[PDB]
Every structure is written in C-alpha cells, then in structure tokens.
Amino acid sequence: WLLLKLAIVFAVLIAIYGVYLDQKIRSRIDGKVWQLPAAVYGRMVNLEPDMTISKNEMVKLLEATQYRQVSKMTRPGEFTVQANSIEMIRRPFDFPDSKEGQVRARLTFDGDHLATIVNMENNRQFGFFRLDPRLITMISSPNGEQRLFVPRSGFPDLLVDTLLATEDRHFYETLTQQLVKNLFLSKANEAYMALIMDARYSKDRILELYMNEVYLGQSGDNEIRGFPLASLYYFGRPVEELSLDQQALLVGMVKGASIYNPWRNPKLALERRNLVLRLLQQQQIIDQELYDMLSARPLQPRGGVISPQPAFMQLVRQELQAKLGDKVKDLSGVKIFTTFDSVAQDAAEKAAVEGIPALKKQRKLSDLETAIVVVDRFSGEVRAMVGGSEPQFAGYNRAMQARRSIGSLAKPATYLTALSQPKIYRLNTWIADAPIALRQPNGQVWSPQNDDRRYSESGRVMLVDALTRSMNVPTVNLGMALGLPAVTETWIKLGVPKDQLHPVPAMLLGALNLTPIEVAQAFQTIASGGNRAPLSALRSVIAEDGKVLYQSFPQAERAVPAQAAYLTLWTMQQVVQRGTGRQLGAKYPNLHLAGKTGTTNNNVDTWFAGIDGSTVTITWVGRDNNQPTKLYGASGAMSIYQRYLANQTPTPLNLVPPEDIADMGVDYDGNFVCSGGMRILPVWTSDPQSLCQQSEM
Amino acid sequence: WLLLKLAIVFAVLIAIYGVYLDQKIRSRIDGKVWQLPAAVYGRMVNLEPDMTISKNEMVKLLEATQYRQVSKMTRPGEFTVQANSIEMIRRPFDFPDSKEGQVRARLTFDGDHLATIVNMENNRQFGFFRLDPRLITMISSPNGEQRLFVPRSGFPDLLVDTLLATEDRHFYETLTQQLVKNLFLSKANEAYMALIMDARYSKDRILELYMNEVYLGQSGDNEIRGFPLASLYYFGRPVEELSLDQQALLVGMVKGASIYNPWRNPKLALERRNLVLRLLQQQQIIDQELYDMLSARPLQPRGGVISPQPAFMQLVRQELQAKLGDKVKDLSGVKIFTTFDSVAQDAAEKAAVEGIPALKKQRKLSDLETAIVVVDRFSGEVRAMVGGSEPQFAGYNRAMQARRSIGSLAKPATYLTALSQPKIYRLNTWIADAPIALRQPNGQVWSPQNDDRRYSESGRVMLVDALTRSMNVPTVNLGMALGLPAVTETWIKLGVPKDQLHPVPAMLLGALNLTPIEVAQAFQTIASGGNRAPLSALRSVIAEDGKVLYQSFPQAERAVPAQAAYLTLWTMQQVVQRGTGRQLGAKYPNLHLAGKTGTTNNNVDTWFAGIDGSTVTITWVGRDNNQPTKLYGASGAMSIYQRYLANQTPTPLNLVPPEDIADMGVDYDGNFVCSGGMRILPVWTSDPQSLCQQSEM
Ligand SMILES: *C(=O)[C@@H](NC(=O)[C@H](N)c1ccccc1)[C@H]1NC(C(=O)O)=C(C)CS1
Ligand SMILES: *C(=O)[C@@H](NC(=O)[C@H](N)c1ccccc1)[C@H]1NC(C(=O)O)=C(C)CS1
C-alpha cells in the first residue's frame, strides 16, 4: 500500500498550512486588530455645591446627556425626579483626569441653586461631581468601518446569554468560525482557523473580539459594526444600558442587518425581534410572565444619524489640523473632547427650525436663512454652532462660511475706542447730530443719514444715547474725531481678521464683512471684560493608552481696558432695556442682557449680539441670494435669539464694575453735579471730584 | 492526535475517486474509443497471366497505387524495374475477399501482355494476383477528429524505439499520462489516471492507443490525428513503409504539430527533424556513419490534401445515400470500396490542367472550362470524374451539375432507332438530302441547315455517311420518318432522365440538355453492345468487424438489339477514321476508336464521346457563362480526349461482330452485289442472299 504512505504527507502539508495560519492570527490579534476611528465627545460638566442650576435645568441637562427618567432606578444612565431633588446613577466613564465607575447620587436643590450632591452609598457630600460627556460622532476611518472598542466587562451577562441562545454553546475545541469569517475571509478554511483561534485564545477574548466585529448597520459609505456603536446608533445609550427587548433586536440583526433594519422595513424587524424573544423563553432563563410585555414595546430616534453636528464638526476638524497637523489620523482609538454644549445646541437648533418658517410665512418670503454661534463669555469656548434653517442635514455652514456686512454691530468698537480715553470721552460726552458731507477720493460727497433721516432738536446727543439708539450721524462724527486708524486698532485687538479691515469712513457704519464666528470673537473680547480669548472647539486629544496628545490651556490676552469694556457693556444693556433692542428687555428684564442690533442697507442682513451671564450669542438672519428680508435687527435675528433664550435657562447678566468705576450724577445740560442730578451714569474715575471741576462754573 | 484520524479519511475519499475513474476508463476503452471516420478506397485491381498490360503501364499503375521505384527492395510498397520484368513487394491489405500479408512477386512481360506473376518465395505461378487499392480520402466525422485505426503489429519496431527515445522508458507502475491528457482531459489528475491505466491495461495496449490518438496535423476544420493517417497525409505511404527520417519528423511533431508543420515553416520543421536524429544517435541504436545521410534528405506532396477528388466524391456520397440511407454514418470504422481509377484520373486531370490554358491562349479566351467522365464500357463503373479546368481545388462539379445542350451527340440515337429495323434501314439506306421546311405550332417554319449550308449533288446520301459526316438535313429526314416517339423510346432505353426528353423535331439535332454523367450512361448502353448498365461509384461497403453492409452486383439490362448497337459503333469508327473525328484517327489508327463529335449553335458547347476497348469517355468543353468558345467538336473537347489518351495507355477497340452480322458488298448505286462492289458494309442478316433479291433487277 502506497495509499497511506503518499496521503500521510497530506496531513503534514495541511498541518504546516495551520502553523502558517497561527502565525497570521497572532500578527493581527497580538496588536492592531482594527483602525478604530476617533471618538468625539461633548463638554464634561462638573457639578458643584452652591452652583447656579435649577432642578428643571438639571433634568434638561441630564436628558441631553443620554440620561433616562424613570420611577424606580435599576440600570446606570437613569434618573428620578422629586419635589426638591434628583436621584441619578452616573454611568461609568473613562475621564482623562481619573477613570470612574457607577456613582448613585442625590442632587438637592434650593430653587435657583444646587445645594448638595450626596453619594447614596455612604451618605457623604461631594466637593465636585463629574457628569460624563455625550458622544457626538465618530471621525470617518479611511477603511470605511466604524467601531467603538469595549472590553469584556463592558458587555452585560444578559446580552452574552441573549447571544449564546441564538448562536452557540461554547465548550468545544461556530462563534469562533463567524469571527474568522468576518475578521479574515471573503467553509473548510474557517473551521480550520477556528480550531487554532479557540485553542490559543481563551473563550473571553473570542466573545470580546466577536462583539466588536459583527455588522449591525450602515450610514452612507460607513459600516456600523459591533454591539457598542450599534447601541448608540439605534437607540442612544451604551451597550451596558440596553433593555432586553433592545438586546434581542441587536442580537437578531447579526445574521442579516440590511433586512432587519428598522429604518427601512419595521414589520420584518419587529417580527425578528419577537423571534429572539420566543427563542429565549423556551430556555430556563425567561417565562411567559413578561414575554408579552417585552414583545409589547415597539422598539429609535427615526433620523439617519449620518453626519451629527456638521456645522460644529467643521471647526473641530479645522482646529485638529491647526494643533496636531497630519497625524493624529495614523493613531487608533483616539478620544477627542470638545467644548460642545448639548443644551445650547438643541435650543439653537429649535430656534432655527421653528423661527425661520415662522418668519417666512409672517413676512411672506420664500428663502430666509440663519446662523447661530454660542461662545463662553470668558474662556471663548464654542458651545453651539448653527449653519442654517435646516441644521440636521447640512452642506453649507453659514456660521463659518457666510461672510456678510455686519452693519450696526460695528458701532460698539467706536464707542469702546472713545470710552478707552476717560480724560476725554465719557458716557455724558455731547456728540454733534447735524448734517454730514464728507468728500472722498472720487470726489463724491458721502452724506450718511440717521435711520429716520432726522436730527436732534438741540443739534446734539450724549454718547450713551447715540449707541443705545444706534444713531448713524453721531457715530460717524465720533469715529472721525478719534480717526479711523484708532478704530481699526480696536478691531485688531477685538480679534477680527486683519485683511478684512478697510480704513474708510464707511467702516464706522458696517463696511466690514465678517462671518458670525468672527463676530463672536469681537463680542467675546468686550464681554469677558476686555480679555481677548481665542475661540476654541478643542479641550483635549487623548490616545488609546491614555496619552495626552493635545491639552488646551487658558491663553486670554488683555486687548482693551477693563473700564472701557464695562462702560460699553452697560450701554449695551441700555440698548436692550430702552434702545433698539427694547423688545427683548421687556420679555426678560431680570436677565439684564447686554446687546446690539444690526440692519444693513435695504434690509439685506439682520444681526443681533446677545450677552448673558455665561455666553456671547451671535445670531444672523438673511438670504443666501443677498436679497431683502423685509426684516430689521430687532425683528428676525433678535426674535431667533429670544427663541434660543426661551428654549433654555439663560444666566442673568450682573455686571461687576471693575476698579475706578464711580456712579456719577449729571444735570439736563449733561454736567456732573456734586449731589443729585436727573441721570446716574457710570464713570471711569478714581476720584469722583470730577464734579467739583465741573460744578465750579 | 486527530491529524492522522481526520486525514486518514482523505486517503479513503481520493481512493473512491480512483475507483470512479477506473469505472470511467473501462466504459470508454472496453468498447468505443473514437468515432472512426469512413475509409474510402479506389479500385482493387486483380492481375492475371495473359492479361493485356505492358511493363510501362504496370510501372504507372504501381506508382499510382503508392508504390516506390527502388534499385534494391527492402520494405513493402516497393518495386524494381528490369528489361522484361518487374519485381515488387505487394503490401499487406485486409481485402474483403480474404485478408493477405506481404507477397514478393516477379511480373514477367511479353511486350503488350503480362506473361506470368510468380511468388519469389516458392518460385510458383499465381492464378490471379491482387493489387491493393489506394486510399483516396476519409469522410468527415462530425466530431471533427480524423484517424485510421492500426493494431500493435502495424507499427514497426524502429518507430516504437524512435518514440521511446524522445519520450519514455516504460517499466514503471508520462506515456500513459500523455494518453489520458489527450484522451480524457482539458497535472495531478492525469498522473492519478495513468496509475490506473498502466495497472489494468498492458504496455502493448497503451502504445496502441497512444499511436492512434496523438495530434499530428490540420486540414480545414478536421484534426489529423494518429501516426497511420499522418503518414499518408505528410508523405503518401502507410506507417509500416516509412523511412527513419520520416519517422523522426512524425515523432518530432508530437509535442507541437502546428509549429513543426512543413507546409507553413520548413526551416523549423527540418531543424526539429535533425533534433530527433541527434537524440537517437547518442543511444546504442545509431552511429554517425549515416546521421549525415538521414539529415541530408530534406523531408512531401506540397498540396493542402484538404478535399481529395471532390468531383468523384460527390457521386460516392450521393450513392451511399441511395443504397444505405441515413446510417451507415452511426457505424464506426467503415471501409468504402469505390470504382475509382487512379491511372484514368491523373490522366484526365492532366488533360484538363494542361489542355484548357493551352486552348485559352491558342483561341485568345479568358474563361474556358471542361468536364470529363470515364466509365467502364460493359459494367458501367465510373472510373474517373473531372469537374473543371482546376480539378484539385473545386466547388462546382461540371460532370454532375452542368446541364448543357448535347448537340450532335443526339445523332447516334436516331441511327440506332433506324438500324434497329434490319428489314428497312441498313447502312446502305439512301437518305434524302434536300431543303426542309417543317411548320410547327406557332406557326413558324423550321428550316434546319447542314453546317456548310450545302446539299448533296445527287440530292441524297447513304445512312452510313450521314452519321459519319454528322449531316443535319438527312438526320432530320430519317428522324421524322421513324417518328419522334420511336426516337424518344430509344433514349429512355439508353438510360437518360425521362423528364429531360422533349419530343419536338429539334430533339433530333440536340435539343436535349444533359450533364456529362447522363451522356456517359447513353453512350455506355450502346458501347456495351446494347446492355444498359446503371453507372456506379460503389463496389462495396464493409463494417469494422468485416460485416458486408452493401455489395453491388451485375444488373445490366438489354435495351437495344446487339446488331443495331454494333452497326452504330462501326459507323462511330468511320467518324473517327474519315468523318468529323478524323483528326483523332490519324493520330491513333491502331486504336479503332468509336466516337461522335458535338458542336452546339454559335460554338457555345463542344462535345466528344470516345470509345476504346475498355472505356467510354465523355468530354465537354464550354464556358460557364454560356458564351462562344471559338472552338468546334473536333477541336477543344476532342483535343482534351487526345491528351487523356496520350497521358495513359488506351485499349484498342476491336469490335466483335455479334450473331447475324454479314459483310456485304454494294455498287455505286448502293445496291447489294453477289460478288464484288466498290464498298463493303456490315449487315444485320442471317442469310446474305439479300443480294439475290437486289441483283435480280
Ligand atoms: C445699523 O445697522 C444701522 N443701519 C442703517 O443705518 C441701515 N442702513 C438702515 C436700515 C433700515 C432702515 C434705515 C437704515 C441701523 N441700526 C439699526 C438697528 O438697530 O438694527 C437700524 C434699524 C437702523 S439704523
Ligand atoms: C451537331 O452538333 C451539329 N451541329 C450544328 O449543326 C451546329 N448548329 C453548328 C455549329 C457550327 C457550325 C455549323 C453548325 C454539327 N456537328 C458538328 C460536329 O461534328 O461537331 C459540327 C462541326 C457542325 S454540324
């Protein structure tokens, strides 16, 4: 017999093929298994005793951070609402500062402020309590396969059993065969690889690799793979927080994700979900005492979840390039922590989605558009970005790309340049309000007019009223007295791009084309108290091994004096209370908002700059075809800001006067009085006996 | 270990695949291996003592039957030439009568006749000696693969060794691998099949199957496979009769027949032939004492050998359908024995190939054509068929397909109808030669004229002279006296198609459109002595197992009386000696040829019917466009027959007078005389005292 002898070498030749496969499995598994895309997270909110936040504001903040309201808590990422407190189970999160687990706390409130945050385990108060950030999106991997790596513990025991019942009973050496099918191949070859895989790597590793590989959905040209990313994609909570009905649907989609897609066909997807529920009940785990309760819950955010936050993600990407260059991207398992505010965004999106079609019908238009930028008053951190009236599905971001004439938003700069000189210009400084005729290099006569084409009876107005009422004629006169290079110098210090400044008399009235983000920088500089803080979207960039690649730091710069900024901010409160913006100040008088309206020529662009206790908000309302809006600054843009304020809880603006601020009294003539006077104006002076020098006449 | 245990079943699964292959090899080999195409052979010539054949005629007959002239005989199919004898080795042939082997005989001659055929082994005379037939062609197999099966002995020992040296040394268990590669497949599968093939079937069978399978050439869309058919295709002798240089070329072509094809590239083919010769010399068989003698012989008939004898093969195919129907063809290894004469054909082809371009230049024409049919005088067996001036490459066969007006070839029929009545018409019967005017159903006057438009001085001519000189006017008068139905009755008896006979006065002059084969039937009937023998191309059809499928038998039928046919034949000798055909009778007076010329109106068609001692030859010369040839009956057609007679050895016509034939004397008045007379004519009379009844006046 030369049958065995010749075919003995067949066992040898296939065994050496197995040693070749073992060498290949180790090359992949003992190291890089996948190119894990960059995880993009929102702001990490730290709660504190005596912090200004209400019970309702906390529910809205919890709900925005993927937390669920329940009557009785069991799972993490859940909360209960009481008459004066909130009980929650803060989900486990690998924070860059320190990795944390499950923390069950009670948040006791006293109306407007947070009294205590007590651990429900030991009954002890917290010095500060960390709220985990919400996962915004994932930056597209070139491979086209999107995942979120989660270890063995991260998957609950119920889900492992839900998967075991529909697929395998591990105790041999199909689960390890399916792994090698998705992980390596395009039947005999996979069964041979599974023999090696099971023998070398322990059971725990097999189900860890499988639960992060399996195909579960599709978004454009990106594969939604593995149970952890699928959980957030289909419902909106981590894999650990799933209910059994949701686990059954995720488990059911494994053998055919495309036909069990609830977005396309819900009937077949619901039918397959009940099939998983009817498979589990047959086994020792479940009884028909709740099968009809799980099968009764029909499922989902019903959106495509393709490009989450396209307006804000443009800036994130642009800043990742500015700080880390070209890689970044080579690295796998990157964690990006942004300045993004889920509360401010939903409110800004709702103000855009509802406000615009309401202004389109009201004014009888066909193509009105908008742009909203929300930044932190002091730090300059970009909290929210709205690129248009349709912020969900966007291709054009009007917050970073739409360069438009700013209009009357250019007025504070002139007054800030004047109020920078306390020895000359004060709030009671009389500005001429009489006809203007300025000959230019043409030589055509430039005769700017006031909005009503009227001039003051006495032929003058005080500085304070000129900005409050957004008067053009006194603005030019003041701006021409300081000189255009001085006013152009203020703008550079405010943070606006240098190449956009054209020093011509028209600049004082709005001949400055900026994007809402560039406008947000100029208003932030004055709102912080004169400190120019460069606007940012990146807080930190962390690697897989917890290595800090990028870490942002406070880099604020003193641009304009503190007292000049305060005097401008105080006058900006007068525009919101009595001036052009008085329609807002009547709706919210207890917010003491500092603001400025903007209306370009022929109602082409409508602008509003709103300053609360915590944020600087730039709202722009206009048409993409540069056509009339039949809208003003107070209407349109400001009515979108009022909607943004009504959609959330705004912080009231309490202006803390800095050094050398003295509230002085003036008479009808505008002269400082020792005691009394019909008007009280703040003055940048260290010795109020500026009245004595004035009263002596 | 579950390595051996799991892979022990791999030896089992491949062994059961081998038992499947053994079952498949037996299904093919133990029975039908190939669909062997029908072998088509020429006439089987039987030599006899006292037979009329010369030494030179025998050399020509041997050379035509693939026999080679040598100075010293060694191999079969060879012959030597002496002063009065021929020594030959008659090759082995499986004759239908009795299978024979190698016979070395001396053929002693006495000028014109064969004296003795003596076996050179025992020095004994033969009663009859069989000459093997030449293989004409093979009838195309639907499979498209042409072969000629030859057993193990059929291949010489030198050729087996010539093949062994270039390929294998059989003693194991590549020769059996090459077999299964060509015989079954489109490397591992063939080596596995070769293990089975070698183990079950003995060595002898392997080389028998291989030597009949191997690809050696191509002809149109037919594969020339195996050494036996390749031998005749490339050289012209059976595989047994090859020289070592020819064996080496055939052996060399095995690994690549297309690039070692001597028809396309002779340089590479000659180079590879010397490569085989230089491989054999290295081994114990050959020494450099003759390598330079074998390598010095450069090779071949240089023709395509695509469609051998297309004109004659049309009839073979047509008759195979008439006698055996649709199968035939299902059967494999069929042997077809035809009436084909290789000597008559080469001579008829040479007369067409040389004669036509010679008549084209001579007469200054551009498209002259021809057709030649040679049949056996008595049996009616078709010996040769020429379809045109280019008989090698033919698409149109003018012998079976070209229907043309016969002209003066219609004259013998009228005289045969007249000479059938001995009581009325004799050779000395006076026929009127005066103007004719026959009113027809138009009513237009038909006035036929003699070729010279002249009439006899006395106003009459004798019957004998009227046919001899091919006179039109006396032919009509004789034909109208017998009546057209009597003359139409003679034609039916002669064997011409019934639907082509139009009984109108014009028929007597050539208003009869026939093909040369149909003309061959009419002239055969009279040349045999009045016996109509249906013309045939098939002698027998034999199966592979020597089973007689078809066997032809003598089926001659008495059509016209013997004496009437003789009197017509004797007058046909007068046309060749003194009449229209006198140009032939001066070149060959000792042949006493019986003939008739034919010239249609406006020299459109030229015809000649030549009768020798053994054959009836119909020659037609005309243009395919029915245009003037500038040629007559005596010139053109008859000049092609003279070339056919000069290219071979014709049998002299010695007319044996049948019963009641008496040579009688006539005076100038044409009356029978008792003794004397200026003319001697044969008369169908049993009592010559027809002179007494005549002389009494
Ligand atoms: C600033 O934008 C300043 N605008 C104008 O002077 C433009 N050219 C204008 C537009 C409509 C009607 C009259 C003049 C204006 N400031 C505002 C404002 O507070 O929004 C408007 C309403 C007019 S003065
Ligand atoms: C028979 O073919 C008979 N032919 C004619 O009468 C034709 N019409 C003819 C052709 C040319 C010149 C005069 C008449 C003739 N038989 C032959 C012959 O023997 O071949 C010819 C030459 C003229 S009579």
Cβ density class B107-135: b for 16+ within 10 Å, e for less: bbbeeeebbbbbeeeeeeebeebbbbbbb
Cα–Cα dist B103/B119, whole Å: 7
Ligand 2, atom nearest to B448 Cα: 6
What is the spatial distance between Cα B144 and Cα B37, in angstroms, rounded to a whole number?
9
Mutate to test the pocket of ligand 2, among B433, B514, B599, B621 (most ligand atoms within 8 A of CB): B599
Task: Find residue A249's DSSP bridge partners.
Answer: none
Strands B145-146 and B222-225: parallel
**Cβ-contact B509, B476 below 8 angstroms:** yes
**Which one, of B198, B490, B146, lies nearest residue B332 by Cα?**
B146
Angle at A406 between CA A403 and CA A407, to 5 degrees: 145
DSSP-based three-state secondary structure for A573: helix
- Cα separation, A416 vs A490, whole angstroms: 8
Contacts of residue B274, Cβ cutoff 8 Å, sequence gap at least 6: B295
Nominal resolution in Å? Answer: 2.4
Residues in a beta bridge with B384: B374
Rounded to 10 degrees, the C-alpha dihedral B176/B179/B180/B184 comes to -170
Interchain contact, A7 vs B10, CB within 8 Å = yes
Cβ B314 vs Cβ B400: under 8 Å: yes
Task: Confirm if A612 and A324 have CB atoms less than 8 A apart.
Answer: no
Please give the DSSP secondary-structure letter assigned to residue A51: B
E-strand ranges in B50-110 read 68-69, 78-81, 85-90, 93-94, 99-100, 103-110
d(CA B91, CA B77): 5
Provide the 8-state DSSP code for A303: S
User: Solved by what technique?
Assistant: X-ray
**Single-letter code of the amino acid located at B188:** A
Region class of B226: left (phi > 0), else alpha (psi between -120 and 50), else beta? left
What does the angle CA B88 – CA B90 – CA B93 come to, to the nearest 5 degrees? 170
Query: Would you say B618 and B516 are in contact if contact means Cβ atoms under 8 Å apart?
Result: yes
Tell me the two tokens of residue B293. Answer: 């003698």
* Cβ neighbour number for residue B35 with a 10 Å cutoff: 15
Backbone angles phi, psi at B99, to 5 degrees: -65, 130
Please, which residues have CB within 8 angstroms of residue B67's CB and are 6 or more apart in sequence? Answer: B77, B78, B79, B88
Minimal CA–CA distance to A636: which of A233, A257, A363, A231? A363
For residue B11, list chain A residues with Cβ-Cβ distance below 8 A: 3-4, 6-7, 10
SS3 content of chain A, % helix, strand, coil (to 5): 35, 20, 45
| CB spacing of B4 vs A8 below 8 angstroms | yes
What six digits make up the tokens of B572? 């046909």
Q: Which member of A408, A536, A635, A639 is catalytic?
A: A408
What are A137's two structure tokens?
């999106």
Nearest residue, CB atoms, B7 vs list A3, A6, A11: A11
**Sheet strands (E) in A220-341:** 222-225, 335-338
- Whole-number Cα distances in Å, A641 to A392, B265, B602: 19, 94, 116
Domains of chain B with CATH codes: 1-30 (1.20.5.100), 37-44+303-697 (3.40.710.10), 45-134 (no CATH), 135-302 (1.10.3810.10)
Q: A100 an active-site residue? A: no
Q: Give the mutation target among B451, B465, B635 for probing the ligand 2 site: most ligand atoms within 8 A of CB.
A: B451
CA–CA gap between residue B383 and residue B386 (Å, rounded)? 11
Comparing CA positions, the residue from B309, B306, B371, B432 lying closest to residue B598 is B371
Q: Which residues of A229-259 are buried (b: 16+ CB within 10 A; e: fewer)?
A: bbbbbbbbbbbbbbebbbbbbbbbbbeebee
Question: Quick one: how far is CA A292 from the chain centroid?
Answer: 41
Of A259, A283, A293, A286, residue with least CA distance to A164? A283
H/E element, A412: helix A411-418
For the beta carbon of residue B483, count every other beta carbon within 10 angstroms: 12
Q: Which helix or strand (DSSP H or E) is residue A375 part of?
A: strand A369-376
The residue annotated as part of the active site, out of B389, B408, B528, B635, is: B408
Question: Quick one: tokens of B509?
Answer: 């002059």
Instruction: Look at residues A627, A435, A412 and name the one whose alpha carbon lies nearest to residue A530.
Output: A412
Question: Nearest C-alpha of chain A: how many angstroms from B12?
Answer: 9
Joined together, the tokens standing for residue B664 give 């009688």
For A222, B75, B254, the CA distances from B251, given in Å and listed in that order, are 64, 20, 6
CA–centroid distance, residue A112 to ligand 1 (Å):
38
Residue B590 phi/psi, 5° resolution? -80, 5
**What distance, in Å, lies between the first and last C-alpha atoms of chain B?**
134
Distance, in Å, from the CA atom of A570 to the CA atom of A576, rounded to the nearest integer, reads 10
CA A368 to chain centre: 24
- Residue A164 contacts residue A170 (beta carbons within 8 Å): yes
Candidate from B3, B6, B11 with C-beta closest to A7: B11
For ligand 1, say whether the CB of A597 is within 6 Å of any of its atoms. Answer: yes
Cβ distance of B11 and A14 shorter than 8 Å: no
Alpha-carbon gap, residue A139 to A39, rounded angstroms: 7
The widest CA-to-CA distance across chain B, in whole angstroms, is 134
Picking from B2, B5, B14 by the largest number of A CB atoms within 10 A of its own CB, the best residue to mutate is B14
DSSP string, A5-19: HHHHHHHHHHHHHHH
Tell me how far the alpha carbon of residue B104 is from its chain's centroid: 27
Q: Is the peptide bond preceding residue A40 cis, with omega within 30 degrees of 0?
A: no
Which secondary structure element, helix H or strand E, spans residue A541, and what is its range? strand A538-542
- b/e string for B10-29 if b means 16 or more Cβ within 10 A? ebeeeeeeeeebeeebeeee
Q: Which residue in the set B4, B6, B11 is minimally distant from A3, CB to CB?
A: B11
- In degrees to the nearest 10, what's the CA dihedral of B509, B511, B513, B517? -20
* DSSP string computed for B344-385: HHHHHHHHHHHHHHHHHHHHT-S--EEEEEEEETTT-BEEEE
For residue B628, CA distances in Å to A337, A498, B604 come to 108, 107, 5
Hey, what are B98's tokens? 């009795």
Contact A4 B15 (CB under 8 A): no
Ligand 1 atom closest to residue A597's alpha carbon, by position in its atom list: 20
Dist. CA A501 → ligand 2 center (Å): 120
* DSSP symbols for A165-222: HHS-------HHHHHHHHHT---HHHHHHHHHHHHHS-HHHHHHHHTTTSEEEEETTE
Q: Which residues in chain A precede a discontinuity of more than 2.5 Å between C and N?
A: 173, 186, 299
The 10 Å CB-count burial string (b at 16+, else e) for A121-146 is eeeeebeebbbbbbbbbbbebeeebb
Task: Select from A516, A142, A63 the least CA-distant residue to A311.
Answer: A516
